[PDB]
Amino acid sequence: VLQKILIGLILGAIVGLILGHYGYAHAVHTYVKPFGDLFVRLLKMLVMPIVFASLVVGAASISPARLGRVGVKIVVYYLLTSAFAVTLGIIMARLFNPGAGIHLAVGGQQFQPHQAPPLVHILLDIVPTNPFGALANGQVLPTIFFAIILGIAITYLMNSENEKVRKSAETLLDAINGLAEAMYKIVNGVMQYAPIGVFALIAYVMAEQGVHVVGELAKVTAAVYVGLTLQILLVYFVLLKIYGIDPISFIKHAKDAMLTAFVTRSSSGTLPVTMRVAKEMGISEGIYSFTLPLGATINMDGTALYQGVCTFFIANALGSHLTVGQQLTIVLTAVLASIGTAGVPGAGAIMLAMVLHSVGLPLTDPNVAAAYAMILGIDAILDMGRTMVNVTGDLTGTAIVAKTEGTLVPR
Amino acid sequence: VLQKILIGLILGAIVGLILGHYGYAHAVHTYVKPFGDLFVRLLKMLVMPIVFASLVVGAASISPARLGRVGVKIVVYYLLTSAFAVTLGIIMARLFNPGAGIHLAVGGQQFQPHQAPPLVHILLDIVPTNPFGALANGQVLPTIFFAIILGIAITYLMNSENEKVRKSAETLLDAINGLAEAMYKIVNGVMQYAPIGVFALIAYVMAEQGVHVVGELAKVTAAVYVGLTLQILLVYFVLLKIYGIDPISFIKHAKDAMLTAFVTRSSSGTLPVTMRVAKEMGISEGIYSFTLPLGATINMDGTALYQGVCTFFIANALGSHLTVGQQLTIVLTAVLASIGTAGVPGAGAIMLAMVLHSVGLPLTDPNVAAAYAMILGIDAILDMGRTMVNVTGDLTGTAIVAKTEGTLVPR
Amino acid sequence: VLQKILIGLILGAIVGLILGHYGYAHAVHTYVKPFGDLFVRLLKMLVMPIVFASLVVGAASISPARLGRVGVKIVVYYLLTSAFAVTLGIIMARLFNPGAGIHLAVGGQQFQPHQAPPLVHILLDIVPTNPFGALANGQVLPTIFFAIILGIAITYLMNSENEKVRKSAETLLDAINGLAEAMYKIVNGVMQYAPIGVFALIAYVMAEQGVHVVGELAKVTAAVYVGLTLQILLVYFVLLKIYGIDPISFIKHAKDAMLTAFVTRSSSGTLPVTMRVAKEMGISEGIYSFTLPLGATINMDGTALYQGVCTFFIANALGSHLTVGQQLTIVLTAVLASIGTAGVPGAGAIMLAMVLHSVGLPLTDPNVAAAYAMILGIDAILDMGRTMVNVTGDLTGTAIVAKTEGTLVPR
Ligand SMILES: CCCCCCCC/C=C\CCCCCCCC(=O)OC[C@H](O)CO
Ligand SMILES: CCCCCCCC/C=C\CCCCCCCC(=O)OC[C@H](O)CO
Ligand SMILES: CCCCCCCC/C=C\CCCCCCCC(=O)OC[C@H](O)CO
Ligand SMILES: CCCCCCCCCCCCCCCCCCCC
Ligand SMILES: CCCCCCCCCCCCCCCCCCCC
Ligand SMILES: CCCCCCCCCCCCCCCCCCCC
Ligand SMILES: CCCCCCCCCCCCCCCCCCCC
Numbered sequence A, B, C: 001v002l003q004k005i006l007i008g009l010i011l012g013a014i015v016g017l018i019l020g021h022y023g024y025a026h027a028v029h030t031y032v033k034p035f036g037d038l039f040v041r042l043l044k045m046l047v048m049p050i051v052f053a054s055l056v057v058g059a060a061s062i063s064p065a066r067l068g069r070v071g072v073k074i075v076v077y078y079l080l081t082s083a084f085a086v087t088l089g090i091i092m093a094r095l096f097n098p099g100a101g102i103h104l105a106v107g108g109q110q111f112q113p114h115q116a117p118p119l120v121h122i123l124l125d126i127v128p129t130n131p132f133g134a135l136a137n138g139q140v141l142p143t144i145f146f147a148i149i150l151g152i153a154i155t156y157l158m159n160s161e162n163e164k165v166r167k168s169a170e171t172l173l174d175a176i177n178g179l180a181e182a183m184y185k186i187v188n189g190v191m192q193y194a195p196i197g198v199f200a201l202i203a204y205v206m207a208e209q210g211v212h213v214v215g216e217l218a219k220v221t222a223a224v225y226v227g228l229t230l231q232i233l234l235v236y237f238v239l240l241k242i243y244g245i246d247p248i249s250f251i252k253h254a255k256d257a258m259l260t261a262f263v264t265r266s267s268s269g270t271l272p273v274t275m276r277v278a279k280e281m282g283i284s285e286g287i288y289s290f291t292l293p294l295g296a297t298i299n300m301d302g303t304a305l306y307q308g309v310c311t312f313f314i315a316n317a318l319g320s321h322l323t324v325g326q327q328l329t330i331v332l333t334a335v336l337a338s339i340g341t342a343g344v345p346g347a348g349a350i351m352l353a354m355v356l357h358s359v360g361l362p363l364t365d366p367n368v369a370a371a372y373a374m375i376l377g378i379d380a381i382l383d384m385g386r387t388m389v390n391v392t393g394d395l396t397g398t399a400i401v402a403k404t405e406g407t408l409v410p411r
């Protein structure tokens, strides 16, 4: 029930700030957060079953050729929106000018960012050498790959002349479809707990980081969140309408994944809600079962935009000036970064470091590190918004593609 | 066949002691033990399939509400019996006074015990973020959690108005039930090898550690084993009868898991036998599929009792006196310890260290370490008994709960 | 299509050598190899599903007793052919005298070989303590073990008097058989990409290592490849014909796995092709589903032969002379080595080190290391041939056993 999570969101926000103000933050950490973390875990639990099972069923429902057209379409969409995101972040930064006048003292946290594996590696790894391992290690891309191959192959089998082959292929499908159906059913149950979860999650963030949102760090929050707002209005909404979708209808249907993403701060972990949203939008499983898990890992408009704003904040705080040529470099790098970290765990951190280095602000610089460490103080706050844009772009792309594919039913 | 394993148990015991006496222990290690270790592996092999599959089928057979009442009931039972166990160990220690007069020289083995993760962590981890990972990593609690959720959800699906949904849910169930049935079938085969396995296992223990059972270490063995005996007679038997179960009937049915636990020294690894025992007792799968795997990981009366006796042995050997207040502390800590190590691998070692530290005998003390190292010399001997009490308590709880739940058939 | 891969093999070979000669090797590394590596990954992807599923179906189709006779038969075959292989390598070495006159300077690469776990360990580990873990970790032997047990048990279940038990066992079988069928279907698709894959793979090897094949390293290549040829002609062919199989028919059917092994340099990774080959030979799934995965891990005639030739090359390069008694030692050790590394990852490297040490040439000797490092320069070249003999022996054994088992249909 929407009312209820919205109450949880609002109540938790304010109680978090109140308790955080009176230095009862470590109480919230101890006694409250747990109930939030549970919600997250409960959702994450569904991910690898619901992604795998849904895709096998989906991949087997529609023609390979359509799937491939779907793939081209969304990939292009994911690329363009990402590029506009990081761009919009630069604009947002140049307009609001966060991080300026800051003269931080070196010391405190240092980082040695992990290096992104080469692009070839990352592409190759889309193909699992062991699908059972990919499922157990929770690797989404390889799971996507195998699910599709298996689904396609199942369809061939069901067109066999030998009944025995047909029947055993049907059984596997039905079993896997049983699992898919089950995971959607479980989502409905989990979402009853959402109010308590949503409450506890936001409460903790507000109690911990709500307080830190002051001075220049408020400028960053503003720039970021105005940026994120603008991506939704000026990009998604406009696009949705161009392709004959009512933005309000979409929000109406999408609201559940959007709210879950915001608090959960997990694109991956919101997937089950996202995927149910698309189902309830009446989108073909042959589409969203592919696009949404893909988008969840490679399509992060929120993050892109943040990377722009963060690069400028750090540059400002060091008194660096970013030429237009450097601004170009940021966009390019941001786009490449998300491609070249596609499967990689903790890809957000790596990307940022790549983007920062592209304009000569290595995180291994003590002055850069001081600046970064400052903005990290409120990352949870930032992460909520940007995660939610991350998910919302997936549904937008999925909606748009679904819409251009017109009528589409199983074979 | 019972006769046969009892012969294996007895033959192996005596041949182990004979060979061990004549310094042919490393022969037994080399050429005999392997056949025992095989038996253990063969049983362990069934665990994660039979736990998962059985629970899905079970969770789907009975109402959630009943399952929850079942859960409350056994948890309470597991708590009370654990508390009495460790208590009975203290009593057993104060009566027999093991470890007294010992003045060990420092040196030899040292330990740095692993720390137990915080209680919140341990509770949260009951919920797997990846069930395929939990299955592959052999994590029982999270597997229990997911199995139940999946089973419940399958039942909802089978009440669907859409035939297609019903059918695919049925298929998944039947597939999983096939796997469950298969694992029970395999147990029957494995247990034919039990005589050889039981023989080799006990032979090795007697040949290695049988000899060490002398002086104060005999006092410890006595105290422990008298303790373990007393738990069965004064606790399980009495309880069984209060709840209208014949202790001899129970033993008659239970004997197989009891004997397997004793030699196998693995609660987890005995599970398949335990779970077959409960089936042959005619207990609802909706009950024992839940209670027995749970009890197997969190309900260890044998270990609790040992912890009591071990704390006193170490204290005695150092000339420490344990006030009544400290004795209280041991009980509490022992109980908490098993809760706060629920999922954790090598939880036995951690628990003991926690209990020892609770009364000011840290294992990082060279004098404590010398004392502990002494009792470790015969841990295999000790472990046999205590493992068997560990398993037996599970069946007792399961029997009692099953009995209070009265008539119970699938929906 | 055969024509096409043969064109890929030939084209790639020559273009590799041409580009390699003109110092464009790192181009081939960068822009070509990827397409080859993809082919390998695509095949590896099928391995654990197709091995597991095929064996369950197979083990359930034929009587345990037959399976056991099959097992004895192939094991014996695997042992004899291995012994002849390493022997033939010694002969090949004494005839061609590779490595003689070489006086290498110490320095460059050093190795500390991993130690093989004890034989008992390796045998025990055939039995998985967690089959889900064995599947996810891609452990073949334990997967073989469990698949067989599960398959046998399924058959018992299907002879049950209770319909419910029968039906749920059937469903599991059909589901698993669906998966098996699917993997074979996928192989057919993958093999359409083979021409491009085969091209890129060979191109890279020729561009990288083709050039290094000169002087004494040419002598080694010759000795090895003549050896490998001779194993096929004098051993497999002769054996095939003794047991009433036409060598050319066999090659005709086998060619696909042979060519895939050669380029792929992965016995494991060729399995899916190998297993399809045997199916198309009309061999019982109850046989090849067992023998081929087994042979793929423990039966490596190519490697054995190489080990012989490599031991002599190293000995020659150091000016060591190998007595007839030492030559005996090599054979024995080579045979034992493959047994005592059965499941072990990177078993090839370990085996070689064991064999080298058996005659007093430890890889930790800087002079030995220099010699070994030299031959490593062309290992890819060597590996192609020896991998292909490795696979071919599996099909030969499988064909021979299948043939001696006469008519064999499901129960
Ligand atoms: C459904 C509509 C309701 C939406 C409302 C849901 C709550 C959103 C919370 C944060 C969003 C990001 C804004 C960050 C807020 C920071 C709090 C703050 O400014 O506190 C500073 C401190 O009080 C001075 O020292
Ligand atoms: C079914 C009824 C048959 C039950 C019998 C099964 C065997 C039980 C073995 C050990 C249990 C614990 C007792 C430990 C025995 C230690 C042996 C011992 O005392 O030997 C000392 C040595 O001989 C002096 O130097
Ligand atoms: C189907 C029939 C066609 C079969 C053909 C497929 C290609 C086989 C390639 C290598 C095999 C092993 C031989 C190794 C060849 C080494 C190349 C070489 O000798 O080059 C040295 C260099 O040119 C001087 O500096
Ligand atoms: C006519 C036959 C076409 C078969 C297509 C089968 C499925 C196509 C999949 C879509 C391809 C588009 C690329 C999507 C891959 C994701 C990119 C990852 C970048 C890190
Ligand atoms: C079916 C009837 C539903 C009524 C309309 C509900 C619309 C709710 C609007 C939610 C849109 C965004 C949700 C995310 C909120 C993020 C937190 C706000 C702080 C920036
Ligand atoms: C009326 C709806 C109730 C739904 C209950 C669903 C299943 C209940 C499970 C039993 C709950 C009791 C607690 C058992 C958890 C194990 C404790 C672990 C401690 C480490
Ligand atoms: C159906 C007929 C069965 C006859 C009765 C069998 C009863 C056997 C008693 C076994 C009870 C405990 C088994 C574990 C033995 C532990 C080793 C003893 C040393 C302490």
Ligand SMILES: CCCCCCCCCCCCCCCCCCCC
Binding pocket: C064, C065, C067, C068, C069, C070, C071, C072, C075, C148, C298, C339, C342
């Ligand atoms: C009459 C009952 C026989 C049951 C046999 C069940 C299956 C037999 C399997 C074949 C046994 C031969 C040994 C093969 C094991 C592989 C050896 C690995 C060496 C590293």
Ligand SMILES: CCCCCCCCCCCCCCCCCCCC
Binding pocket: C002, C251, C252, C255, C258, C259, C262
């Ligand atoms: C069905 C018609 C097929 C025609 C006959 C095809 C026979 C091809 C012969 C291939 C045999 C070996 C294949 C591996 C080649 C290894 C590379 C050669 C260099 C040593």
Ligand SMILES: CCCCCCCCO[C@@H]1O[C@H](CO)[C@@H](O)[C@H](O)[C@H]1O
Binding pocket: A245, A246, A249, A250, A253, A281, A282, A283, A284, A287, A399, A400, A402, A403, A405, A406, A407, A408, A409
């Ligand atoms: C406003 C909420 C989002 C709507 C997204 C529009 C995408 C339409 O979705 C499409 O609709 C077709 C017609 O029913 C179906 O046949 C297709 O399977 C489906 O993909």
Ligand SMILES: CCCCCCCCO[C@@H]1O[C@H](CO)[C@@H](O)[C@H](O)[C@H]1O
Binding pocket: B245, B246, B249, B250, B253, B281, B282, B283, B284, B287, B399, B400, B402, B403, B405, B406, B407, B408, B409
């Ligand atoms: C003495 C061996 C242990 C017996 C345990 C008694 C628990 C009874 O078990 C119960 O029996 C009911 C009546 O048949 C069944 O309907 C229930 O499913 C079952 O849980």
Ligand SMILES: CCCCCCCCO[C@@H]1O[C@H](CO)[C@@H](O)[C@H](O)[C@H]1O
Binding pocket: C245, C246, C249, C250, C253, C281, C282, C283, C284, C287, C399, C400, C402, C403, C405, C406, C407, C408, C409
């Ligand atoms: C030349 C290609 C290899 C041929 C291998 C010969 C092995 C024969 O294979 C056997 O044939 C029998 C008769 O059809 C079948 O009933 C058996 O299932 C099968 O194992």
Ligand code: NA
Binding pocket: A077, A078, A079, A080, A081, A082, A083, A299, A300, A301, A393
């Ligand atoms: Na994007």
Ligand code: NA
Binding pocket: A267, A295, A296, A297, A298, A299, A300, A301, A390, A391, A392, A393, A394
């Ligand atoms: Na996304």
Ligand code: NA
Binding pocket: B077, B078, B079, B080, B081, B082, B083, B299, B300, B301, B393
């Ligand atoms: Na207990």
Ligand code: NA
Binding pocket: B267, B295, B296, B297, B298, B299, B300, B301, B390, B391, B392, B393, B394
């Ligand atoms: Na237990």
Ligand code: NA
Binding pocket: C077, C078, C079, C080, C081, C082, C083, C299, C300, C301, C393
């Ligand atoms: Na061999």
Ligand code: NA
Binding pocket: C267, C295, C296, C297, C298, C299, C300, C301, C390, C391, C392, C393, C394
């Ligand atoms: Na092989």
